[PDB]
Amino acid sequence: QELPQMTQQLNSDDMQEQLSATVKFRQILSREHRPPIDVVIQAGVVPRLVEFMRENQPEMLQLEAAWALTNIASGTSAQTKVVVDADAVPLFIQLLYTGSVEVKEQAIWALGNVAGDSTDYRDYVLQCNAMEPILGLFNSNKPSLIRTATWTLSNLCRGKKPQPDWSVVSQALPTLAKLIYSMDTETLVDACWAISYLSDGPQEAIQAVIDVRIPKRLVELLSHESTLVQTPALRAVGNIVTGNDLQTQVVINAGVLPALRLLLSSPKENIKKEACWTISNITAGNTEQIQAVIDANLIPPLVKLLEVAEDKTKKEACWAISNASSGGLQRPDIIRYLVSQGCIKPLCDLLEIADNRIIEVTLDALENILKMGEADKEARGLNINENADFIEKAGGMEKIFNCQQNENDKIYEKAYKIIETYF
């Protein structure tokens, strides 16, 4: 259409024509569905647009050109590659330092799409030292800019395989710690995602998150009126409790248990699922933390979900109760408590799920219950294992016996031993 003329105008030496042309390119690219990215790329104007972002170029030109490149980078890795190979990244970064506010708003968005393309482009942007100028944007007192920068910042932290350069992304913790206190929902959401990414890693990363005192706030955000905030905050909390017993205790001390208790009755199924997931990693802790969960009255509602929640959630509830049962070896009463709360019936019923990882998890729990029951019997001269009688009455014996027919050897081995040992 105008593209042929637009291309010629863009390469013109007249600046009025360059700007008119750049704006048209920005306009045709501003489409959410099926943007004319390839047509613009093939017009061969990317290097020219990148050229308009140079430091001494007219402001409007830098602005429109960066905006256009921003949307080209919003495409596939192939289309994004064109922008990157044209050396646009280092220019986006410099614009973050010298550009007018409007210009910076384009540049940071562009960096957001580039870093969000893949681990390599994420690393590339980090290698170009984008972190420093980016963290600087949070002192702008500019909402729109901060929102985009928070998002961009999260893409720089995102990715577990490969994990981003920790020595660089860790630099953003102090900033993220303050951002989760923002009243702007949009910024808060992205800050929480960023944090969940940084929290998703080695012991030192979780510890760095704990050291800046982020957990206290994450727990409070679990009750934020929007699930858009609850989801990431809960994710960050969950990732943190995948840490050691000490790190996990910090989260417990920040009062996560009562909060999780409320999440167990959330209207959103994924919230209930992740709340159980989070509890499962706490009951995977030491004796005291398993007891803390017990004292926080999480078992009853956990048992309820185990019996009536959607499968994905039930599986998570199963992990929690099962990890908790592993503590009975050190404290039998934990098993007595679990059984008194009716975990046996739901656990057995779950033996028929189409997930072997869960069958194993359930068989282990039932065995932890069987062992305690056996020890109690041995302890006080009885000849009947009370918990074995409970399992049989719950129809669990028949189900366990059937797991022996599972093609999975591990399942088979577990079921067999349980049957021959307690039944």
Binding site: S30, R31, E32, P35, W67, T70, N71, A73, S74, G75, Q106, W109, G112, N113, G116, D117, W151, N155, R158, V189, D190, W193
Partner: peptide, 9 residues
């Protein structure tokens, strides 16, 4: 959330 965002203003 989405890794990329088209900028429309």
């Amino acid at each position: 959330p989405a890794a990329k965002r088209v900028k429309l203003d």
